[PDB]
Amino acid sequence: KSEVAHRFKDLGEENFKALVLIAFAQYLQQCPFEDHVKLVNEVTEFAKTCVADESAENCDKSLHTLFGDKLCTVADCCAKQEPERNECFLQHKDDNPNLPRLVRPEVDVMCTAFHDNEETFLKKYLYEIARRHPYFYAPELLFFAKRYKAAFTECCQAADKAACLLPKLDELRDEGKASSAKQRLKCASLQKFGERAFKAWAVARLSQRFPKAEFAEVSKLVTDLTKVHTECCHGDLLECADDRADLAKYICENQDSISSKLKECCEKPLLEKSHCIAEVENDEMPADLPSLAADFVESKDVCKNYAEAKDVFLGMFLYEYARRHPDYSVVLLLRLAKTYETTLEKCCAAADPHECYAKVFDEFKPLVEEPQNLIKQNCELFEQLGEYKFQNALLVRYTKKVPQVSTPTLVEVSRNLGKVGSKCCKHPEAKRMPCAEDYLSVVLNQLCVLHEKTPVSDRVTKCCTESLVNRRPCFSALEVDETYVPKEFNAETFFHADICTLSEKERQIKKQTALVELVKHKPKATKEQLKAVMDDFAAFVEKCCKADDKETCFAEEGKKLVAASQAA
Numbered sequence: 001k002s003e004v005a006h007r008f009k010d011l012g013e014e015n016f017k018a019l020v021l022i023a024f025a026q027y028l029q030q031c032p033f034e035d036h037v038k039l040v041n042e043v044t045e046f047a048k049t050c051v052a053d054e055s056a057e058n059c060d061k062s063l064h065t066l067f068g069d070k071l072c073t074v075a076d077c078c079a080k081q082e083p084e085r086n087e088c089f090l091q092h093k094d095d096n097p098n099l100p101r102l103v104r105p106e107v108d109v110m111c112t113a114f115h116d117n118e119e120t121f122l123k124k125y126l127y128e129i130a131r132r133h134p135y136f137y138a139p140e141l142l143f144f145a146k147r148y149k150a151a152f153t154e155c156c157q158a159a160d161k162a163a164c165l166l167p168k169l170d171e172l173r174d175e176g177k178a179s180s181a182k183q184r185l186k187c188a189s190l191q192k193f194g195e196r197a198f199k200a201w202a203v204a205r206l207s208q209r210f211p212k213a214e215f216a217e218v219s220k221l222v223t224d225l226t227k228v229h230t231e232c233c234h235g236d237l238l239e240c241a242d243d244r245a246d247l248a249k250y251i252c253e254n255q256d257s258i259s260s261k262l263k264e265c266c267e268k269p270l271l272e273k274s275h276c277i278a279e280v281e282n283d284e285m286p287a288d289l290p291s292l293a294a295d296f297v298e299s300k301d302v303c304k305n306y307a308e309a310k311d312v313f314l315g316m317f318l319y320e321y322a323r324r325h326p327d328y329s330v331v332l333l334l335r336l337a338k339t340y341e342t343t344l345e346k347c348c349a350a351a352d353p354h355e356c357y358a359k360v361f362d363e364f365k366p367l368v369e370e371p372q373n374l375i376k377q378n379c380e381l382f383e384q385l386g387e388y389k390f391q392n393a394l395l396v397r398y399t400k401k402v403p404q405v406s407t408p409t410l411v412e413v414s415r416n417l418g419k420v421g422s423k424c425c426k427h428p429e430a431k432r433m434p435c436a437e438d439y440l441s442v443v444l445n446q447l448c449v450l451h452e453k454t455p456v457s458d459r460v461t462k463c464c465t466e467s468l469v470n471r472r473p474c475f476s477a478l479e480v481d482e483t484y485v486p487k488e489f490n491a492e493t494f495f496h497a498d499i500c501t502l503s504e505k506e507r508q509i510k511k512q513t514a515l516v517e518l519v520k521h522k523p524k525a526t527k528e529q530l531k532a533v534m535d536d537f538a539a540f541v542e543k544c545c546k547a548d549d550k551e552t553c554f555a556e557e558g559k560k561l562v563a564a565s566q567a568a
Helices: 003-011 013-027 033-052 063-071 082-091 107-116 118-132 138-155 161-193 195-209 215-233 237-253 270-278 302-308 310-323 330-347 353-357 361-401 407-424 429-452 458-466 468-477 504-521 527-545 553-565
Strands: none
Touching: 003 013, 003 033, 003 063, 003 237, 013 033, 013 063, 013 118, 013 138, 013 237, 033 063, 033 118, 063 082, 107 118, 107 138, 107 161, 118 138, 138 161, 138 237, 138 270, 161 195, 161 215, 161 429, 161 468, 195 215, 195 310, 195 330, 215 237, 215 310, 237 270, 302 310, 302 330, 302 353, 310 330, 330 353, 330 361, 330 429, 330 468, 361 407, 361 429, 361 468, 361 504, 407 429, 407 504, 429 458, 429 468, 458 468, 504 527, 527 553
C-alpha cells in the first residue's frame, strides 16, 4: 500500500527529495530550476501525508501518475494518459540538449553561494547534471553530490580555496562524465536490444569479478542487477535506488560465497558501499578449474542440454567461460557465447553432430586474436604518439570512416577514443583487453546515441543497430567512405583573436575541429598533406597571435590560409 510511502520510508527524506529532483530534471530537461524545486517540495509533503496514512485519498496512485501529474502543472506528453505519457517523457530525453555551457564562476562566488544555502547549492548541482545527463545513474549521482558537498565544505574554509577546490571539482566532473557514458551504454543495451542481452552482459561481467561464486549465486545477482538497471533506465529512480541498496545489502551479507574482495566495500556507508561494489576488482579465480570441453564439447548430451534447457545451458557456458577469462573483454565473451550457440544450431541439425560441435572452440581463435592484435597495435601507436597525437590520428581515421557525422561529435568521440589508450595501455597486458574494448564499447555507444539524434551516416546507423556485441568490430572494419561528396571550404567551416587566450584543452579542441573540417574537404588526403595544412594553420595562428593586431592579421591571413589550403 502507498508505494510513495514505501519508497519514502525505505529511502529516507533526503535521498527521496534528491531522486525526485533528478527524475524531474531528466523528464523536463528545459524546465527552470525553481519550478522543479516547487514540484519536489509538493510531492515530498504529499509523501509525508501518505506515510501519515496509507489510505489517504491519492495515496494509492502510482509513482508515474503522481510524477506526471506534477510535471504537467507547468507538452505533448501532458495530453497523454499515464501509460503512454511515461513512455512519451522517456523518449523525449535528449542526449545533447540545447542548453548553455555550464561555466562555474570564481571560487569566492561559489563558496558564498554555498554558505548562503548549502541545500539550494547542492540541488542546483543535481539539477544541472541530471538535465544534461538524462540517463545518469541516479544513486551514483547521489554519491557524486555527497562528494560535491564534502569538497565545498572542506575547501571553502581553507587558506587557498582554489588550490583545494578546483582539482576535486575537475576530478568529479570527469568521473561524472565517465559514469554517465557507462550508464548510457547500459540503458541503450536494455532499451534497444532487450533485457536478455543485459542478462548475458551481467552474467559475463559478474562471473568475471566473482569467479568463486557458484552459478546460482551469480544468476540471482544478475537478476537483481537487471531489475535495478531496468528501473533506472525507465525513469523509476526511487525503486532503482531502493533495489540497489537491497542488492548491496545482500552482497555484503553473502561475501563469503561471492568474493574475498568485498571486505572494505562493505564497511562503508550506503552510497560509497554500492559504488565500491560496482567497481571492485576481479577476485582470484578458483585454483584447479576443469576444461570446458567435458560438458560443452565432448559430452554426447550437448545437443540434448542445448534443446531441453537453452537459457540455463548457455548461461552456464557463459558463466564457466567468463570466470576463467578476466583477460577477455565482456563483449568478446558475448561474441564467443553467440558463436557457441550458433555452432550448436548448425551442428545439432547435422548427420554427425558430436564430431561437428567437437570443433566449436577452434572457431573462437579468430574472434580472440582480433581484439588482442587491435589493442596491441593501437597501444604501441599510443606509446609512440602520446594522447593528443593519438586523438588526432583517431580523429582523421574516424572522420574518414564516417564523414557525415557532425564535427563536434567526431571531435568528442575521437578525444574519448584517445583517452581509452591513456586509461588502458599503461595497464599490464594481463587485463588490458577488457579495459580497452569495454571502454571502446562505451565510447562507441556515445557516438551511437549522439548520431541517433540526427542520423546522417548509414554506416553509423548500421553498426549501431545491428549487433551490440559486434559494434566495435563493425566500426573497426570500416574504411574510407568513397561515396562522401567532399565538403568545400565554406564561410564558417573555419579563426578569431579569442583563440590566442584559450586554455590548452580548448585550443586543442579548436585545432581538432579544424582537422575534422579539412579532412572533410579532402577525405582521401594523405597524412603528409594533412600535416602540411595543419602546420600552415599553426604558423598562421602563431603569426597572428604574436602580432600587434586585433584579429586583423586573422582576417586577411585567414583568406591566405583558405586559399593555400583549398589548393594543397
